[PDB]
Design a protein around this ligand. Structure first.
Ligand SMILES: Nc1ncnc2c1ncn2[C@@H]1O[C@H](COP(=O)(O)OP(=O)(O)OP(=O)(O)O)[C@@H](O)[C@H]1O
Ligand SMILES: Nc1ncnc2c1ncn2[C@@H]1O[C@H](COP(=O)(O)OP(=O)(O)O)[C@@H](O)[C@H]1O
Ligand SMILES: Nc1ncnc2c1ncn2[C@@H]1O[C@H](COP(=O)(O)OP(=O)(O)O)[C@@H](O)[C@H]1O
Lengths: 500, 234, 480, 72, 11, 179, 145, 72
């Protein structure tokens, strides 16, 4: 501890060779509200990092004829109005490596958890171009979210951009966390980008991750609501850069942009402060470009680039149910599918509050395994018929027996779509659940018993008949032998449950 | 087209303002390529389109590509003509962007024949007053909702319904029944959906991958990853 | 000091001061304008530098009024970001946006000051302790259990509550609290400020016999104050609470009046600060201006700040930008419905809108969680049956929906409760209802054994024994 | 308000070349700032509102905005 | 809140 | 550009077409000290003052200071079209367009102590070859705020910079900071 | 405009006993355009004033005159601005009148009724008939009691 | 400057003197029964109103300390 400081001083004095280079420099004219108009940076390029006399670092965004409008990644309190702004020549990279797994970082790829510092050797530009047409494939691998109503009705594949759009406090963050926890068995690197959130919310989310063990394969990019607008606007792009590193190294990744609406509002704030012409809801005309340039990075690579992929799960919050709002329409146009959450469904008890009648997935059944499509067909047909007859539920007594049967079937298929928070189901468990419900081996129980019977049944199968799990896992198809094992387990569990 | 060389004066997003010599400046709707530079260290040129003459030897353009890494004083070349894309049998079975640059990685398309994209409509005396019925070979469309020759038709189907198979069947039918040819233009094309469409077009025989230029369709792709200038003019 | 400037322009609250060429203030410094009083006498006006204008000018929003202020007045650059007295010298005294006492007592000890601006606590120094403190109100004990050490929010227009609610919470908790309390009145009325001050002197909190034995520090900038003072009174009170959380390491109880006023004061000055208008008329920096102050409010793992904030929802537009950007910062929101105030279900708390993050089974207990879920489902089912009732007839309804409607009307009546501070409005004495009695009462109601009491037997009663007593009294009035 | 259309440098050069003289550009206007369906023409001192003006390309125009130093 | 109450009336 | 830029460029054009570049430079350097000393600047500003009273004194200043007949025309036009309130900016801007037309660059040498001018001519030659200045107007100031040596600021205003006085301690503290 | 109206309204105050207990009571008037509380100036002044008295054109036309739309018209001072007689007799009246209004709304689509519900309806209607007043024809405090 | 009587005869170049006086009104008794016009000037045609106290039209509001709870 005595000579190490001296040898570090010696190595750091022998490292540099006193090199000289022409720097592009300028002087601050006016600074205020996170923007600086600086005079002199003539060779500066659009999107380049400039460094201020007081240590603040900013981006040269709009290059006008008289000055350079610069957004500050910090507080411009100490900027002097005459201080020297020296351009760095670089465009906004981050150091990237595998040592980020388990870490919490801000939009500068620097740790905010105080667990040390990431050793990173490679580097990647924050704004990197998306994969082209010829460096892509068709999305065919499923991305299991653990939510049965998602994986059966709105299936997500690896390389697909699915929108988690809903009202406030309907369960968007919950769906995102259940998917990150369900990625436990799979080798999917997960990325959660917290944009403009409260710091205690990010604290709870990351401690929940560490508890359930989903922190060994996850990275958390956090830009809370006290951050400058520039950092909350840059954070999803650093998340995308990290996931792109892992994607091009033949790994499958998952990225959740929680409240991309906050990124749109931050970008609108800095656009308005740079005095740019606004549009609808004062959003700049390139806010669609902001969102699309980010979402097109989520690709499924081309089997000569490595078969890797990056699934993107952006989260968009609607206000007063206005799906026709500006940013929701933008992201709905950009993304592959949409997953709508309803506050009426959330209040009525059905959680997660997925509105399947209005949720789409343009990828379709190609994002499913072969064992899931068989049972998902019947689930889809029966839930559709229930949605038809739902207005007739108050007149059920004076109706045909087939109509009463379809009404009861739908109203107890709705009970198995309910699911507690942070409890994602494995694909075999949800396949067996859909099979039982859709065939009608629970058309005898009471609705206050369907969920409990199904929990006991899933535990019973997973413990007593592991051959069903093995058949559905290895062959990925709903084999007749699996059907036999499942019918035997259903009979035996019905007897054990009627034993009370 | 000449030594009409300009210099960038402003870079505010995808809208740039270029300064020129006093007597010579491009017309409105006129391509100008920006001899820009990449941060990687290689020349990378950017195409823009004059939208408005600003007065003191200054025009204002919109970049058909990104504007990252562009400085003021970068050399801008006037081209004397609007964006001229390649046209003809060389544009068949090939994917193009808004600038006519092939993005299918099959190689270079020969710009022997280049027409300007900005052009006046056919003349009133060159029009045709005949109300003819387009023949698609599909019973329902030919019977209950007939099409026009030279007329426009709005597609109003959602997702999952037989829409892409429908446009492929229309391409195949116009090429086989008549001597027809097809041109698909993807405005705001999702990239993965564009790749899927290209693969299914190749598979369905619409794009003869074994022999290009025997194809029935030429694909033009202006994607969402692209600035609103490209997405508008594709 | 050495940095003496001159007023260049006066436009309402915004004034830009011309300073020497090299020497200038920083953003968020305090400038002191040597003004003249109404009579012939020197007056002081404090300003706050907002932005550097480029020609040795800096825009500053004034804390006081500028009527009577000439161009070319000397301006003293204090070189500090507008410090504020903190510590025990603040407990029991009404303060100002400038930290000066306005309770007509002696001066305050400037020995321990703190600047009005600060950065939020780091991410490593945050708590993850998920607790619940009991308030005594049925509707928030059973539906939106408020978190101990968290940020609570009160939404609603003008005339639904949030002020009677915040006074009831003050009544119920500010003396049962161990640490100090801090009230910040941002852009609210002066009559309510004087009433709260008299009631705190009465309740033995101010302890007027000796002030330093008190546990509250009132900071106040009301409607009559300029937009620059309503914009910084929140940071003043927040700084006073930061000191009690960090240096004294005691649990602070921070009550805030309308934080909508903190945002609309910024939106008022923002046009004069040259900023271009955002969505419907707020400043482009609404989200960051909210976020700075909100993230500064935090339980920092060495002390905790429980923050109860009233958020004015303008024109009952719950999707207005100002409340929309607050929802994301609060932990347990509590929406107030004008539809319940219109019939007297005070506290007119919207049961299906008021959510909370403590209502989780592992935090709250399975009995509490399940009874809250059942109440919410019954109210939602009744709200969805509303139009099949309101036109097609309540008589033709099925057997299960008639029981749903009856039990939901009984639940709606039972959510109301008479407050101790609102016996001037309800004309009846107030009642404190513990959590267990709430759980037991709602479990009785939706059990089906209280199906015999009239609906009005559940109106404005403390607990379920009061409901049964009121039912008995109603039956007696109906018979003889 | 700080900028104008004939603020371009060649017009000011011509004005500095000779200050007081006899004849101005009477029917001769030099176009500048060709915008969006409008063209702010310097010159045309004797022009009337509603005047048909003929461009070099061949386009017809109508003198709408007769400002102090430029007609639009 | 006028558009939302219109949407709810339509619903 | 700007009003100052466009007017100063017009003055430099009309003074270059009939070569008076030395004469017009001397005339604008006299006019910069004329229009400094703020009472006379306020007087030619202060739009309440009659234009005839402005122009009388302006012609008399032309007579007393021996200005060029086209720069006098320029200030007559600045009085005619009311851009005289920007005349300070126009005169401060004229030097840059003058250096552009004469191909001269001007670059400050902020040093600590004076120089024996041989290395200064070396620096001037270097900065004129790297920028294409046929005659660079190298300049310097004696400033104790520097630490050890010298640095150059050339380009448009000071847009480029190479520094060896304080750059070495800056990079040393940055390297020992390792952050 | 919020500051415009607030610095004007906050002058109306009740002075302390040291100042003489002088008072100024303000009765601002705001016109609505077809009943738009969402309009800027209405919701500006509503949050500044202590109470508000909402008048309806529907009640006016239906003959409820004065046409106070009680239920959305409140008093922030409450029974403290009443004599002990009026506190005694009219303390719990606003909340019971709102509850009667909701009850009478819900009983429109009820076929069979209880006797207690019919009696509550009858009391509410008698009170609603009592609430009417000819213009410039006032009652004193004892007549009101 | 906002004109209190929208002067049609204010000429471009006429003098403007400063009163040194913040806006006030002559307020006293004998306003009871009078009709005035926001300058406290009689418009009822019965004479002029005697006043000497001259409060300000922009007086500050009473604070928390100098107020009492509304109880009458
Ligand atoms: N499947 C579920 N089962 C039970 N409770 C749930 C479920 N999903 C969400 N919740 C509850 O809903 C509440 C809000 O959920 P969450 O925060 O995930 O939604 P959100 O829309 O992200 O919230 P915000 O609008 O604040 O971002 C939480 O208290 C959570 O416990
Ligand atoms: N004429 C047809 N005959 C049989 N199957 C069809 C026909 N048209 C469409 N389909 C099926 O319906 C599905 C519709 O998908 P597609 O039309 O490609 O979706 P999109 O409308 O998003 O392009 C296709 O997978 C296809 O297999
Ligand atoms: N708990 C309650 N009990 C009875 N009346 C209430 C209650 N809460 C609010 N009110 C009514 O609301 C009026 C004032 O509401 P207030 O709390 O000032 O709302 P805000 O501050 O949001 O405008 C009071 O006059 C009272 O009549």
């Amino acid at each position: 501890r005595a000579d190490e400081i001296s040898k570090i001083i010696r190595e750091r004095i022998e490292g540099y060779n006193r090199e000289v280079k022409v720097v592009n420099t300028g002087t601050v004219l006016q600074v205020g509200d996170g923007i600086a108009r600086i005079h002199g940076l003539d060779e500066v390029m659009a999107g380049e990092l400039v460094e201020f006399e007081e240590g603040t670092i900013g981006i040269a965004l709009n290059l006008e004829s008289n000055n350079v409008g610069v957004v500050l990644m910090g507080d411009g309190l100490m900027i002097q109005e005459g201080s020297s702004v020296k351009a760095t020549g670089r465009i906004a990279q981050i150091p990237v490596s595998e040592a980020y797994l388990g870490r919490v970082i801000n939009a500068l790829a620097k740790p905010i958890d105080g667990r040390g510092e990431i050793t990173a050797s490679e580097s990647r530009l924050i704004e990197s171009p998306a994969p082209g047409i010829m460096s892509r494939r068709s999305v065919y691998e499923p991305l299991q979210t653990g939510l049965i109503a998602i994986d059966a009705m709105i299936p997500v594949g690896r390389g697909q951009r699915e929108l988690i759009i809903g009202d406030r406090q309907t369960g968007k963050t919950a769906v995102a966390t259940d998917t990150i926890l369900n990625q436990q068995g799979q080798n999917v690197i997960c990325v959660y980008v917290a944009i403009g959130q409260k710091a205690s919310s990010v604290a709870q989310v990351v401690t929940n991750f560490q508890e359930r063990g989903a922190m060994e394969y996850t990275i958390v990019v956090a830009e809370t609501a006290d951050s400058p607008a520039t950092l909350q606007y840059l954070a999803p792009y650093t998340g995308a850069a990290l996931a792109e590193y892992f994607m091009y190294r033949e790994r499958h990744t998952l990225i959740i942009y929680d409240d991309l609406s906050k990124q749109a509002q931050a970008y609108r704030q800095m656009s308005l402060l740079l005095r740019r012409p606004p549009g609808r809801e004062a959003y700049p005309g390139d806010v669609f470009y902001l969102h699309s340039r980010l979402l097109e990075r989520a690709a499924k690579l081309s089997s000569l680039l490595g078969e890797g992929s990056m699934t993107a799960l952006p989260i968009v919050e609607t206000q007063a149910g206005d799906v026709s709002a500006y940013i929701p329409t933008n992201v709905i146009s950009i993304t592959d599918g949409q997953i709508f959450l309803s506050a009426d469904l959330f209040n009525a008890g059905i959680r997660p509050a997925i509105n399947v009648g209005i949720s789409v997935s343009r990828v379709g059944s190609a994002a499913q395994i072969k064992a899931m499509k068989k049972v998902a067909g019947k689930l889809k047909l029966e839930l559709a018929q229930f949605a038809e007859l739902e207005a007739f539920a108050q007149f059920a007594s004076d109706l045909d027996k087939a109509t009463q049967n379809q009404l009861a079937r739908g109203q107890r298929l709705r009970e198995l779509l309910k699911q507690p928070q942070s409890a994602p189901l494995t694909v075999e468990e949800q396949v067996m659940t859909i099979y039982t419900g859709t065939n009608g081996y629970l058309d005898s129980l009471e609705l206050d018993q369907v969920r409990k019977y199904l929990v006991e049944l899933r535990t019973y199968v997973k413990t007593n008949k592991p051959e069903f799990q093995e058949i559905i896992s290895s062959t990925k198809t709903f084999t007749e032998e699996a059907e036999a094992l499942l019918k035997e387990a259903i009979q035996e569990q019905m007897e054990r449950f009627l034993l009370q | 087209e000449k030594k009409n060389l300009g210099r960038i004066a402003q870079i505010i997003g995808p809208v740039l303002d270029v300064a020129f010599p006093p007597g010579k400046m491009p017309n409105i709707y006129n391509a100008l390529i920006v001899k820009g530079r990449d941060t990687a260290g290689q020349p990378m040129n950017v195409t823009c389109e004059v939208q408005q003459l600003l007065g003191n030897n200054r025009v204002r353009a919109v970049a058909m590509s990104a504007t990252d890494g562009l400085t003021r004083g970068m050399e801008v070349i006037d081209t004397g003509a609007p964006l001229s894309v390649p046209v003809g049998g060389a544009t068949l079975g090939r994917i193009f962007n808004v600038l006519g640059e092939p993005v299918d990685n099959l190689g270079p398309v020969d710009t022997r024949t280049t027409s300007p994209i900005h052009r006046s409509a056919p003349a009133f005396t060159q029009l045709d007053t005949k109300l003819s019925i387009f023949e698609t070979g599909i019973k329902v469309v030919d019977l209950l909702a007939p099409y026009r020759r030279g007329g426009k038709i709005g597609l109003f189907g959602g997702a999952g319904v037989g829409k892409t198979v429908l446009i492929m069947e229309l391409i195949n039918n116009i090429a086989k029944a008549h001597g027809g040819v097809s041109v698909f233009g993807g405005v705001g094309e999702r990239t993965r959906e564009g790749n899927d469409l290209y693969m299914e077009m190749k598979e369905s025989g619409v794009i003869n991958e074994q022999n290009i230029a025997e194809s029935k369709v030429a694909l033009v792709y202006g994607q969402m990853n692209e600035p609103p200038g490209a997405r508008m003019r594709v | 000091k050495k940095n003496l400037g001159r007023i260049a322009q006066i436009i309402g609250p915004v004034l830009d001061v011309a300073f020497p060429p090299g020497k200038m203030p920083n953003i968020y410094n305090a400038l002191i304008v040597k003004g003249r009083d109404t009579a012939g006498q020197p007056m002081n006006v404090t300003c706050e530098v907002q932005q550097l204008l480029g020609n040795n000018r800096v825009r500053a929003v004034a804390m006081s009024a500028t009527d009577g202020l000439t161009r070319g007045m000397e301006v003293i650059d204090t070189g500090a970001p507008l410090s504020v007295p903190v510590g025990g010298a603040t407990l029991g005294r009404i303060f100002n946006v400038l930290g000066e006492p306005v309770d007509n007592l002696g001066p305050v000890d400037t020995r321990t000051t703190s600047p009005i601006h600060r950065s939020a606590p780091a991410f490593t120094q945050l708590d993850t302790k998920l607790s619940i403190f009991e308030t005594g109100i049925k509707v928030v004990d059973l539906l939106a259990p408020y978190r101990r050490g968290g940020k609570i929010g009160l939404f609603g227009g003008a005339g639904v509550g949030k002020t009677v609610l915040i006074m009831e919470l003050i009544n119920n908790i500010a003396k049962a609290h161990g640490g100090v309390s801090v009230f910040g009145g941002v852009g609210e009325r002066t009559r309510e400020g004087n009433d709260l001050y008299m009631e705190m002197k009465e309740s033995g909190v101010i302890n007027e016999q000796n002030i330093a034995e008190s546990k509250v520090a009132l900071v106040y900038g009301q409607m009559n104050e300029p937009p620059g003072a309503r914009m910084r009174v929140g940071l003043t009170a927040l700084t006073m609470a930061e000191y009690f959380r960090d240096v004294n390491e005691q649990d602070v109880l921070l009550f805030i009046d309308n934080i909508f006023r903190f945002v609309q004061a910024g939106s008022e000055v923002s046009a004069l600060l040259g900023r271009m208008p955002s969505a419907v008329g707020y400043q482009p920096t609404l989200s960051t201006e909210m976020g700075s102050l909100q993230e500064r409010i935090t339980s920092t793992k060495e002390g905790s700040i429980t923050s109860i904030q009233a958020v004015y929802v303008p024109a009952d537009d719950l999707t207005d930008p100002a409340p929309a950007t607050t929802f994301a910062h609060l932990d347990a929101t509590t929406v107030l419905s004008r539809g319940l105030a219109a019939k007297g279900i005070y506290p007119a708390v919207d049961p299906l809108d008021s959510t909370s993050t403590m209502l989780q089974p592992r935090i709250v207990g399975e009995e509490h969680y399940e009874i809250a879920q059942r109440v919410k489902e019954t109210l939602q089912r009744y709200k969805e049956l509303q139009d099949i009732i309101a036109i097609l007839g309540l008589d033709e309804l099925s057997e299960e929906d008639r029981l749903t409607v009856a039990r939901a009307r009984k639940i709606e009546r039972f959510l109301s409760q008479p407050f101790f501070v609102a016996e001037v409005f309800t004309g009846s004495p107030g009642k404190y209802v513990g959590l267990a009695e709430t759980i037991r009462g709602f479990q009785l109601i939706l059990s089906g054994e209280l199906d015999s009491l009239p609906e009005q037997a559940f109106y404005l009663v403390g607990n379920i024994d009061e409901a049964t007593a009121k039912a008995m009294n109603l039956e007696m009035e109906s018979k003889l | 308000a700080t900028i104008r259309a004939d603020e371009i440098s060649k017009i000011i050069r011509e004005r500095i070349e000779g200050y007081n003289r006899e004849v101005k550009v009477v029917n001769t206007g030099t176009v500048l700032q060709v915008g969006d369906g409008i063209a702010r023409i310097h010159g045309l001192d004797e022009v009337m509102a509603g005047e048909l003006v003929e461009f070099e390309e061949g386009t017809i125009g109508i003198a709408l905005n007769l400002e102090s130093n430029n007609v639009g | 809140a006028n558009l939302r109450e219109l949407r709810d009336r339509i619903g | 550009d700007s009003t100052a830029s466009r007017y100063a460029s017009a003055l430099a054009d009309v003074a270059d077409v009939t070569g008076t570049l030395e004469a017009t430079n001397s005339d604008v350097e006299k006019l910069i000290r004329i229009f400094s000393e703020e009472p006379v600047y306020y007087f030619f500003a202060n739009p309440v003052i009659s234009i005839d009273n402005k122009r009388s004194v302006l012609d008399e200043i032309i007579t007393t200071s021996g200005l060029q007949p086209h720069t006098a025309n320029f200030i007559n036009i600045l009085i005619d079209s009311e851009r005289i309130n920007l005349v300070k900016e126009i005169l401060n801007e004229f030097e840059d367009v003058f250096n552009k037309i004469t191909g001269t660059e001007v670059a400050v040498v902020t040093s600590v102590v004076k120089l024996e001018n041989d290395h200064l001519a070396q620096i001037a030659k270097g900065v004129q070859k790297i920028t294409g200045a046929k005659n660079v107007r190298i300049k310097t100031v004696i400033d104790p705020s520097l630490v050890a040596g010298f640095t150059i600021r050339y380009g448009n205003e000071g847009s480029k910079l190479v520094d060896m006085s304080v750059k070495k301690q800056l990079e040393e503290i940055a390297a020992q900071l390792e952050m």
